[PDB]
């Protein structure tokens, strides 16, 4: 599992559960090809998005549907979504955890890039 | 000045200076039209991107060129950019401060939305 | 104004207003002496805590009463407070902006340290 | 394991490894009694700090030695440490993950309070 997404809710201090995550790879024409997607689990994690075969070097976008998340909770969000865009680079560390911490008017994302 | 962008560098504990910021508005046809752009000043702030008249309702995207920022400091950052996408002025005109704090492998973005 | 505290509310996308802030300086004997205190204003800022003369080298603790803040909004937050502890003015006098972003179960604190 | 600490490095995008964490419980006299401590693992996690028997209701402080961490990496830190102070409350959710994301001049902490 070379790409994992973990999402946390900073309002309720919980995994952000059932958050839609779409992953895109930048095509040669600079458009975003849908690549992988899913909903975060009860631990706010999304595993099995890609394999080490499929996850080649390139620019990827992780799109977290934070707005849907907040709407389901009855809380007014600011952002349309949380968009994480990064170059997956073969060279060094290669397991990516994309950690997102969500608040209605704020989010942070962090990459944990390991071996 | 209804849309301000402020960028802080979490490594240096300083404003993130000369950070390129590009603003887009989603068009009727769902593409991103170029709305405004600028560089953060010495204070890490970007003022004067737009006006009350111009900043109409819509979905805007603020793309903060965090990569060039880190690169020019010799740091190969994780993200290509920090982009904040939001519906603006849905309940009437507001002042938006897009506050972003940058680390090579992390950024956070906060919105300060005030009613003038 | 060498020490400013700014507090943002990440739930409301607003300044965190009337947030009690207490500043302590570690004494020669290692206890926390009360240095200054105040409430964040409408802008979520707290200015005038100290002066260049008073703000001498030392280890300071800024305790942000984030709990009362959330409580008065009907929210039972996780943390009792947000406290930022730092050595100030080690390389000569600096201006410190303690920037804090609050969510009921999370807070972040950033330091903007500038040389006047 | 009712109290876990996870620390991440936002500069290197990695678990924050070998970070000293001290946990304190507020004594009746308002002093902080040392309670539990440890170093974060290679995954930036600190498990086994307490047990569900020992971890009673009360005000706890998690003190993360972020300054030592940054010094070992040759990076000038701002904070002396990251201090997380919270009331452990029996009532509801009761497994605490204290997540800290570290930068030299910034940190955030988040509580993941689960069942
Ligand atoms: C350690 C850690 C984890 C992993 C875990 O909890 O097991 C995590 C997962 C997320 F989805 C989001 C954040 C975190 C986290 C620390 C953290 C990161 C950013 C912020 S922002 C800058 O406020 C705060 C805290
Ligand atoms: C108060 C405040 C300001 C305004 C100012 O200093 O004038 C700001 C500006 C930025 F460009 C970025 C962050 C902040 C901030 C608090 C803060 C926000 C996110 C984080 S992340 C979640 O670690 C931490 C702290």
Explain this structure to me?
The structure is a homotetramer. Chain A is mainly beta. Chain A has a single domain, classed as Transthyretin/hydroxyisourate hydrolase domain (Immunoglobulin-like, Sandwich), CATH 2.60.40.180. Chain A has 1 helix and 9 strands; from the N terminus they run E-E-E-E-E-E-H-E-E-E. In chain A, strands 1, 2, 5, 8 and 9 form a 5-stranded mixed beta sheet that branches. The first copy, chain A, has a 4-stranded antiparallel beta sheet with strand order 4-3-6-7, covered by helices on one side. In chain A, a hairpin with a 2-residue loop joins strand 8 and strand 9. Chain A starts with a strand and ends with a strand. The relative contact order of chain A is 0.27. Chains A and B meet through strand 7 and strand 9 of A and strand 7 and strand 9 of B. Strand 9 of chain A pairs antiparallel with strand 9 of chain B. One copy of the ligand CC1=C(CC(=O)O)c2cc(F)ccc2/C1=C\c1ccc([S@](C)=O)cc1 sits at the interface of chains C and B. Chains B, C: GO terms for molecular function: hormone activity; hormone binding; identical protein binding; molecular sequestering activity; protein-containing complex binding. Chains B, C: Homotetramer. Dimer of dimers. In the homotetramer, subunits assemble around a central channel that can accommodate two ligand molecules. Interacts with RBP4. Chains B, C: Belongs to the transthyretin family.
């Amino acid at each position: 599992c070379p790409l994992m997404v973990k999402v946390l809710d900073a309002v309720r201090g919980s995994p952000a559960i059932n958050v839609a995550v779409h992953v895109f790879r930048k095509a040669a024409d600079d458009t975003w090809e849908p690549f992988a997607s899913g909903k975060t689990s009860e631990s706010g994690e999304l595993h099995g998005l890609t394999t080490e075969e499929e996850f080649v070097e390139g620019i990827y976008k992780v799109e977290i549907d934070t707005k849907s998340y907040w709407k389901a909770l009855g809380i007014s969000p600011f952002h349309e979504h949380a968009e994480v865009v990064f170059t997956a680079n073969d060279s060094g560390p290669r397991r990516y955890t994309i950690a997102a911490l969500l608040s209605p008017y704020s989010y942070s994302t962090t990459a944990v890039v390991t071996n």
